[PDB]
Design a protein around this ligand. Structure first.
Ligand code: RWT
Ligand code: RWT
Ligand code: CL
Lengths: 305, 305
């Protein structure tokens, strides 16, 4: 029993973290085989960020201008290239601790573990979700750039995020491991703001099913709803529209508990209208949206209480 | 910016997890040097749990009755002994991945990371606190016994908890690595319950300071209070008494924000007597008590390992 925001064991990623230095800037890199991946803004000064010409800044660099440190060993850079917003530094040593891995681009609503790093050294691990506005609510200080997001289903590490930026509201933006940013963000200091964020409806429903599996049913009601009527109510509370794909994905949780998806939608409608009345659901006084249906299945017992 | 429930990087502990089997029972073990540490109830059947005589059950077992598996390699047990509620299995192979470590007993209010394991394989990592009633609010299913709790200090892993039991309310109980239980619990199937719990006051204050560091100031006021008047209010809301030691420990957070500890106590007094009035603090509608003053300092500073 119990339900916690759980991250994947970070050991396989810890063995890939390195420090990348270019001039006076120092950040983190990800060392997989003989390549170190890091944000391309490592070659920028603060003044360069207003309007950087990365192609012009990069051509003035040689391999020996990049210092890569793995633990207390200096790696040697033997090539460099830029792919979108990431820099790929070819090194003379393949990482002997390289795990089985894949690069995957995720969709909003999907969760992942973040290994926060400073100076190539891991400091902590926490669970995050890609918000509908393509930002993440992380915990990052100066020096955390290059820290990565990942999932580890089986023994394979699926890298999905690399940290690049903090926005004015304290939320974070980054790229996939091919250097493509999530959202309309750019690696330039310009008027960039997080768009209006919304609640990940399919994840709230998944967490209500987790509460039922763990033994709580107080929030259920005798009503049902059509999918369109539920969406008309949901959008009034800044909740994301629920699609047929989301209803399909909730199928296994619906079968394990015996509660139809549109009947759980009716409980969600009532909870939005009434609040909790001094009660909690899985130790929370707010409706939780950073657990996917897959996360609930992974953590919860296969037997409902 | 940002504030997340952060766990320590789990890599150093992942390299110590093994599977221990005795008869039909299978659980987790911690392999450090040539010793595997696991709950002594591994030698019990369901019938033996009603009233076990561990010395009598153990004398009937030989070294070859214990199956220890580290990955896909079978370790050989060459000796066995019992220390309190922990079994120590001497193996023929020293763990080449043994980190720098210590066994430390923690006090209620202290936090630690848990690496949840099943069949000697790590599945997740999460943060939790030792409650004043000596239980932890963990997330564990059948097979999780032997999973460990820890903190990291530079290069050194301080093991503080080993999982043994789930109580009727869904909360958990266990021992330190010397086999001494936290709380008045016993390792047998009998009527045991979590006592009435209380809120960890020094941790709520630490989290209010974290909210001020991150830009949440609505709860501050012009008032102050004394230790005695604050404790008279706290006792009424099932909050732990605040001591001069707690005030001293909150010193660095008080200096960083410019808010005296008794000044912050006056803000908590008003939150206890009036509530949040539809507002949140660091994304929560409840007063969070599972972040110590040291956890707030570490997360708002970037301490690496
Ligand atoms: C490198 C930087 C950034 O966001 N750093 C950072 C990234 N994560 C967290 C924290 C920071 C800063 C301090 C608080 C914590 C610098 N600011 S910027 O507006 O010029 C900018 C603009 C675009 C990009 Cl891709 C990066 C940056
Ligand atoms: C081994 C067991 C235990 O709590 N297992 C367990 C531990 N963590 C989680 C979950 C369980 C069980 C199933 C639900 C989830 C079994 N119950 S018991 O009352 O006989 C008992 C009594 C004393 C001790 Cl030290 C252990 C146990
Ligand atoms: Cl996805």
């Amino acid at each position: 029993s119990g339900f916690r925001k759980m991250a994947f064991p970070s050991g396989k990623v810890e063995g890939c973290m390195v420090q990348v230095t270019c001039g006076t800037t120092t950040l983190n890199g990800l060392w997989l085989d003989d390549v170190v991946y890091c944000p391309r803004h490592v070659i920028c000064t603060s003044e360069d960020m207003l309007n950087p010409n990365y192609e012009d800044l990069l051509i003035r660099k040689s391999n020996h201008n990049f210092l890569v440190q793995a633990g207390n060993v200096q790696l040697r850079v033997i090539g460099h290239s830029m792919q979108n917003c990431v820099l790929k530094l070819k090194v003379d040593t393949a990482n002997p601790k390289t795990p089985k891995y894949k690069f995957v681009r995720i969709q909003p609503g999907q969760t992942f573990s973040v290994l926060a790093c400073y100076n190539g050294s891991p400091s902590g691990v926490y669970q995050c979700a890609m918000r509908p506005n393509f930002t993440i609510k992380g915990s990052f200080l100066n020096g955390s750039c290059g820290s990565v997001g990942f999932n580890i289903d089986y023994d394979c590490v699926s890298f999905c995020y690399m940290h690049h930026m903090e926005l004015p509201t304290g939320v974070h933006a980054g790229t996939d491991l091919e250097g493509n940013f999530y959202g309309p963000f750019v690696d330039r200091q310009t008027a960039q703001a997080a768009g209006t964020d919304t609640t990940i409806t399919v994840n709230v429903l998944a967490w209500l099913y987790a509460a039922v599996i763990n033994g709580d049913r107080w929030f259920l009601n005798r009503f049902t709803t059509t999918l369109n009527d539920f969406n008309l109510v949901a959008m009034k509370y800044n909740y994301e529209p629920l699609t047929q794909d989301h209803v399909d994905i909730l199928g296994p949780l619906s079968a394990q508990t015996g509660i139809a998806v549109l009947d759980m939608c009716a409980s969600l409608k009532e909870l939005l209208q009434n609040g909790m009345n001094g009660r909690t659901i899985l130790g929370s006084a707010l409706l939780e949206d950073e657990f996917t249906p897959f996360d609930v299945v992974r953590q919860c017992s296969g037997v409902t209480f």
